[PDB]
RNA sequence: ACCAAAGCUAGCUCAACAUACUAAACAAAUACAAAAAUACACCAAAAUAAAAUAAAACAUUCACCUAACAUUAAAGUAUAGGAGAUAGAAAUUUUUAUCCUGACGCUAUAGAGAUAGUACCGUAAGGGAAAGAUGAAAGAAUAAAAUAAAAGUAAAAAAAAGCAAAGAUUACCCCUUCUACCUUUUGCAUAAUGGUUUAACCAGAAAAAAUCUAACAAAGAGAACUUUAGCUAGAUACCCCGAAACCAGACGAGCUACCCAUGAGCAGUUUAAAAGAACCAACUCAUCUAUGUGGCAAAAUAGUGAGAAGACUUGUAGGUAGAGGUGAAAA
RNA sequence: CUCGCACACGCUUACAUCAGUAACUAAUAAUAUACUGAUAAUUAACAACCAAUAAACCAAAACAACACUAAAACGUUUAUUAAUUACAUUGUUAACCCAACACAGGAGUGCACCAAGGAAAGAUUAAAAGAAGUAAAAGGAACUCGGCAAACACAAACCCCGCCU
RNA sequence: ACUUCCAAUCAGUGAAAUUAACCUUCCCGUGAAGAGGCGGGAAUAAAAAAAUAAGACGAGAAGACCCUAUGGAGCUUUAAUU
């Protein structure tokens, strides 16, 4: 009679396990953009001019 | 502290006492035993921190640095070469920080790289006339130094500042032992002037 | 009656290993060796079954005679019960009699 | 266990050539391990077959069964998937094409009677399966009329052939 | 008594699916004119009544603080006034209940 | 479409060799009521094993059954037996060392009981289980691959008539023809027995004489024996489940029978009375009837009853143990 | 509507604070004394542990004055010794224990019968049959094995077998 | 006659003995000697809920009665052996 259910899935995160990684995570590329270029507002009309 | 493990256990690049390991392997389960070819401690020539070349996989002929070695299952993990991509930050309404993860490799797919010619070469341990065990290559015949790697603590003894409860190097190495034939009990009693006159009676042991 | 759904890895048996190639080499040692060793002196196995054959009763009796004093307590008891049951069954039971 | 209803939403059909009839949408949703019983849940599932989603929710709104609230949650969350995950506009243009109830995993207990006797108690769990299809509900079939019965009977008398003839 | 034989599933299906034992549909469901939710014709709207009940509890909760004792009850009529209102001449001589929120639309002053 | 299905490891079995045989751990506490540092002691012991069974009963007897030092023969011979069942030697003979050790043994209802003598059921001796499955990586769970195949249900309730099927038919029925299956019997559709259905597991075993095939043949067999066509070798053989019982050794008087210690209860009322007197509670027994009968209860609830200062109830703890204990005899 | 507080024996954190209950436990829901996780707790004056030898002593407990038969638990003093030295160790929770259950059963003593402790009905309809309770015309055992049961009755007498408790 | 617990409808949780397969009628006759199934005739749209217990030789316990078994045991003695 003493039989019960298993396998309840949950995602728990703590600071301690993240700081105990023996090998630090290696990132191939940076996350954000360092500086966003600001084009002038006239590019919609300059594009029709070649020189 | 040492954590006891079951007689049959599976290793998956996670330390036994981690929450990730407990989530993967609940204490009430046990899985199939994988076949691992026995390598004695004197035959394991792959350490952490030395450049190695990957033979088989999606990337072939590339070289990288070993960061982690799993001695139980005979695994060597290169630094971001045999990589698969996973997600780390997960919540209800947001996912991101796509971080590549490196899959394990066996010893047969990894051969040590000689410093000079930068090619894979078989390595055999040899005993030189200086009494030191130095790995020796087969083709080039050049010895390969040990891969000095920083410890897991992350503290370099070269750059260190003594705290309030840290003993100086001079006092640690200072010698004050005078080897006489009196126990620690006798020395302290006469050092502080504790004087005792009477003596114990006869006590029977059985 | 459910059968497996995946083909098992086929056993690649080599007919020419050391065991099969040299199998039964010195079976005629007596015939072609001036009759110095009977072929029963090549059998490897139990002490009481080297060059001997019998039914279940004669085998248990023979085992008790030779290696009986070297057996364990529990094994010595189980052998005695096996002898008694076979003795009663073979003699006091059956159809042809 | 078996989980095939969830994987039916991952089927990707090839693109349709122009001029072909528009393919109606199909949404598959289910809930697993409901505390309600298998047989009791069936009567609710039989109720809402063939009805549009809006009137299906209206009928289950006032039903006193404990499973009425459970099914209504399933339909509401399945409707959100249809309008967001799929390109189904007109969230009122869905009809319950198929609904059924399956059995889950039971828990066995001991039920006492007296005189030292006992009986095995089965904790009951059931699943609910619903499929929503875009479009107006199909029209329910009317009973055969007097002319239909006469037409079949005369046709039956005309199919007769000489048995064991030649 | 004990059953003589096992009932076949063919017989069980006929009994378990008879039209009497099936759930009957309801044809008296209507939309509430005020809030647009669902209600039956002969039953008050669940959403509208719940709107009233929450407000009634707040009014009664204010009355409790105005009579500390458990056996203190007014001997006169009661009038409830919201923010931005003052008692009328006909409302004088009665206990006053003050509520900070603006007077609700459904509630009508006399 | 649910419930389910599939996997091959964990380990085990039988030997061989073999050191020579109560492992691992013992800082402290462990035979006061074990794991509680510390006070004038007592300490210890043996008496042939019996019976279930076979003799178709059963009394003499009944292999192995504690202690043999083996193998090839003498031999199932001499002998011992209600001379019945069956029991059964010796004199005298034979045996060349070490390696060649592994598997025509099992693969999660198998193999040890074992993931384990742990959960759990017993006061105690004792009994004793079920339970694992992804991948190279789950530090690839908006995760992936695989059968979608047992009974049971859903998709899809049913339409006169019959061991449920067959002959058929343009057509599912309608028509015609047929007394379920095993066991047990002179004879069973029998209203004689057993089975809800599914998966796994579960029951014929021995070589004296013989027949078939072959080697060699007045001789055969790799010693020991048989021989007036015989000797040697191979092949062909004889089940499973179940009693009431019988004997030996352990563990049980925390329930109950009786007794030895040490304690604790009996209010009111009636009488010179604490009189195995009287009325009636607490308290202790359980007369009669009704509910209950898988029940609240493996002996109870409701009403009603008998005793209630005694040969009375009751707590703690100790004593008597199965050829017995105990008993105001009900075996 | 009324078995309430405490100790002994037993059970062994099931108690307390906070949070969670999709599911497991409660034979249902709310929910949490009973299910899950974290944290916390019972402090000795009460109770356990708590001297030996020799000698004197016939004289009951029952309001004990004094007696009965069944002859009765209950010690003081003198002498010889006894480490003499703040604070030792241990039991302190609970809605609980024995009965397979959160069982209408079994369970010792002190003091109250309450100032304390608790809820017979989940929501309806008001059929039969069944169980429990109240009332009844005229008759009052005509019922039935028997006046079993029930009753506004609560009495009188004979016989058989055992004397009686 | 009237109340309460049952009861019937609604909501929640949800057990037991039992079960060869059943598409599971009546009558007379037959028959291992008492037929839902055989034979001769009758009756016959299909299902649900609530009731009464004639039959299914109903369910429960490998009949306690009786006999058999070269099957046991308790008791008694003028059985046999001791
Ligand atoms: K035989
Ligand atoms: K019978
Ligand atoms: K029989
Ligand atoms: K049978
Ligand atoms: K005792
Ligand atoms: K009870
Ligand atoms: K407890
Ligand atoms: K009479
Ligand atoms: K009947
Ligand atoms: Mg019980
Ligand atoms: Mg069952
Ligand atoms: Mg069931
Ligand atoms: Mg005999
Ligand atoms: Mg016999
Ligand atoms: Mg004997
Ligand atoms: Mg003689
Ligand atoms: Mg096993
Ligand atoms: Mg198997
Ligand atoms: Mg199936
Ligand atoms: Mg027919
Ligand atoms: Mg017949
Ligand atoms: Mg007969
Ligand atoms: Mg016969
Ligand atoms: Mg039958
Ligand atoms: Mg019979
Ligand atoms: Mg049967
Ligand atoms: Mg022969
Ligand atoms: Mg005997
Ligand atoms: Mg005995
Ligand atoms: Mg006792
Ligand atoms: Mg009195
Ligand atoms: Mg008296
Ligand atoms: Mg009573
Ligand atoms: Mg009563
Ligand atoms: Mg009464
Ligand atoms: Mg009395
Ligand atoms: Mg009396
Ligand atoms: Mg004893
Ligand atoms: Mg006796
Ligand atoms: Mg007595
Ligand atoms: Mg008598
Ligand atoms: Mg008698
Ligand atoms: Mg307990
Ligand atoms: Mg409750
Ligand atoms: Mg809470
Ligand atoms: Mg808790
Ligand atoms: Mg119960
Ligand atoms: Mg109640
Ligand atoms: Mg109720
Ligand atoms: Mg009635
Ligand atoms: Mg009355
Ligand atoms: Mg009257
Ligand atoms: Mg009369
Ligand atoms: Mg009469
Ligand atoms: Mg009588
Ligand atoms: Mg009476
Ligand atoms: Mg008389
Ligand atoms: Mg008497
Ligand atoms: Mg007399
Ligand atoms: Mg119900
Ligand atoms: Mg019918
Ligand atoms: Mg008849
Ligand atoms: Mg007929
Ligand atoms: Mg007929
Ligand atoms: Mg009913
Ligand atoms: Mg009925
Ligand atoms: Mg029949
Ligand atoms: Mg009958
Ligand atoms: Mg019967
Ligand atoms: Mg019988
Ligand atoms: Mg008799
Ligand atoms: Mg006879
Ligand atoms: Mg006999
Ligand atoms: Mg006998
Ligand atoms: Mg006896
Ligand atoms: Mg005599
Ligand atoms: Zn409204």
mmCIF file of N, CA and C (backbone and C1' of nucleotides) and ligand atoms in Angstrom, chain F residues 266-269 279 281 309, ligand 31:
data_model
loop_
_atom_site.group_PDB
_atom_site.id
_atom_site.type_symbol
_atom_site.label_atom_id
_atom_site.label_comp_id
_atom_site.label_asym_id
_atom_site.label_seq_id
_atom_site.Cartn_x
_atom_site.Cartn_y
_atom_site.Cartn_z
ATOM 1 P P C F 266 -12.840 5.010 49.298
ATOM 2 O "O5'" C F 266 -14.185 4.174 49.463
ATOM 3 C "C5'" C F 266 -15.265 4.354 48.559
ATOM 4 C "C4'" C F 266 -16.190 3.165 48.553
ATOM 5 C "C3'" C F 266 -16.704 2.710 49.908
ATOM 6 O "O3'" C F 266 -17.782 3.494 50.383
ATOM 7 C "C1'" C F 266 -15.973 0.835 48.674
ATOM 8 P P A F 267 -17.871 3.887 51.938
ATOM 9 O "O5'" A F 267 -18.309 5.417 51.917
ATOM 10 C "C5'" A F 267 -17.458 6.407 51.359
ATOM 11 C "C4'" A F 267 -18.241 7.426 50.571
ATOM 12 C "C3'" A F 267 -19.552 7.882 51.188
ATOM 13 O "O3'" A F 267 -19.376 8.857 52.199
ATOM 14 C "C1'" A F 267 -19.885 7.394 48.902
ATOM 15 P P G F 268 -20.363 8.888 53.465
ATOM 16 O "O5'" G F 268 -21.746 9.382 52.855
ATOM 17 C "C5'" G F 268 -22.971 9.099 53.513
ATOM 18 C "C4'" G F 268 -24.135 9.149 52.557
ATOM 19 C "C3'" G F 268 -25.435 8.555 53.073
ATOM 20 O "O3'" G F 268 -26.154 9.434 53.918
ATOM 21 C "C1'" G F 268 -25.002 7.704 50.926
ATOM 22 P P U F 269 -26.612 8.944 55.377
ATOM 23 O "O5'" U F 269 -27.680 7.800 55.080
ATOM 24 C "C5'" U F 269 -28.859 8.084 54.343
ATOM 25 C "C4'" U F 269 -29.665 6.840 54.071
ATOM 26 C "C3'" U F 269 -29.936 5.938 55.261
ATOM 27 O "O3'" U F 269 -30.978 6.408 56.098
ATOM 28 C "C1'" U F 269 -29.249 4.625 53.429
ATOM 29 P P C F 279 -31.252 -5.969 48.654
ATOM 30 O "O5'" C F 279 -31.618 -4.420 48.708
ATOM 31 C "C5'" C F 279 -32.972 -3.994 48.703
ATOM 32 C "C4'" C F 279 -33.078 -2.491 48.642
ATOM 33 C "C3'" C F 279 -32.302 -1.809 47.527
ATOM 34 O "O3'" C F 279 -32.974 -1.849 46.281
ATOM 35 C "C1'" C F 279 -31.926 -0.670 49.563
ATOM 36 P P A F 281 -28.486 1.412 41.262
ATOM 37 O "O5'" A F 281 -27.482 2.633 41.459
ATOM 38 C "C5'" A F 281 -26.158 2.581 40.950
ATOM 39 C "C4'" A F 281 -25.391 3.834 41.291
ATOM 40 C "C3'" A F 281 -23.934 3.861 40.863
ATOM 41 O "O3'" A F 281 -23.769 4.205 39.500
ATOM 42 C "C1'" A F 281 -24.109 4.586 43.103
ATOM 43 P P A F 309 -21.218 -3.494 50.408
ATOM 44 O "O5'" A F 309 -20.112 -4.052 51.405
ATOM 45 C "C5'" A F 309 -19.530 -5.328 51.168
ATOM 46 C "C4'" A F 309 -18.613 -5.764 52.283
ATOM 47 C "C3'" A F 309 -19.232 -5.785 53.681
ATOM 48 O "O3'" A F 309 -18.729 -6.906 54.403
ATOM 49 C "C1'" A F 309 -17.328 -4.382 53.671
HETATM 50 MG MG1 LIG I 31 -21.062 1.902 52.415
#
